[PDB]
Amino acid sequence: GLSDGEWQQVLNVWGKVEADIAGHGQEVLIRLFTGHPETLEKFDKFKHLKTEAEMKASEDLKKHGTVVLTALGGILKKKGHHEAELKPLAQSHATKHKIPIKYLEFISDAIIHVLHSKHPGDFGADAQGAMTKALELFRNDIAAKYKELGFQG
Ligand code: HEM
Ligand SMILES: [O-]
C-alpha cells in the first residue's frame, strides 16, 4: 500500500487537478485517444471525433473528462479503502464497456503525462512516485475484479 506520507502527496497533487477538473479531464482523454486510437472506438459517442481539433472543441468530451476525474478523485480520497467505490467501476468497465486492463494502464500513463504538461517543474519526483503508486493500486484492484469476472477484452 501507500504510506501516510505518500497519500498526502497524492492528495496534494490532486488539489492541482481539482482547480481545473474539466481541463485536466479533457487533456487526459485526448492524450489517451490520440496516443491509442483503439480506445476511441470504445466510446460510440466519441467515434465521430476524427481530429484532435474536433476533440478539443467537444464539450461532451470535457463533460466525460469531468465524470472520469470526479470518480477517480473520490476513489483516491479513500486512500485505498475504496472497495465500494471501485468494485462497480471495475464491473461496469469490464462487463458493459469492455475495457481491457491495458487501456487502464494507458489512461494512468496519460494522467502522469498531463500532470507534467500542465504543471511543468511543479510535479516533483516524490509526487510522481506517490501518484504512480496510487494509480497502480487503482489499476491493480480493478485487475483483481476483472480476474473474478474472467474478463480480458
Ligand atoms: C481513471 C480511469 C477511469 C475512470 C475513473 C472512469 C470512470 C467512468 C465513469 C464514472 C463512467 C460513467 C459510469 C459508468 O459507466 O461506470 C464511465 C463510463 C465509460 N467509460 Fe470510463 N473510466 C475510466 C477509464 C476508462 C477507459 C480507459 C475507457 C476506454 C478506453 C473507458 C470507457 C468508458 C466508456 C465507453 C463509458 C461509457 C461512456 C458513455 O457512453 O457515456 N473508461 N467511466
Ligand atoms: O471513462
UniProtKB/Swiss-Prot annotation:
One of its GO terms (cellular component) is sarcoplasm. It is found in: Cytoplasm, Sarcoplasm. Heme b binds at H93. The modification Phosphoserine is found at S3. CDD domains: Mb (cd08926). Coiled coil: none annotated. GO terms for biological process: oxygen transport; removal of superoxide radicals. Transmembrane segments: none annotated. Its EC number is 1.7.-.-, 1.11.1.-. It is an enzyme of class 1 (oxidoreductase). SUPFAM superfamilies: Globin-like (SSF46458). Residues 1-147 form the Globin domain. Keywords: Cytoplasm, Heme, Iron, Metal-binding, Muscle protein, Oxidoreductase, Oxygen transport, Phosphoprotein, Transport. Monomeric heme protein which primary function is to store oxygen and facilitate its diffusion within muscle tissues. Reversibly binds oxygen through a pentacoordinated heme iron and enables its timely and efficient release as needed during periods of heightened demand. Depending on the oxidative conditions of tissues and cells, and in addition to its ability to bind oxygen, it also has a nitrite reductase activity whereby it regulates the production of bioactive nitric oxide. This is Myoglobin. It comes from Equus caballus (Horse).
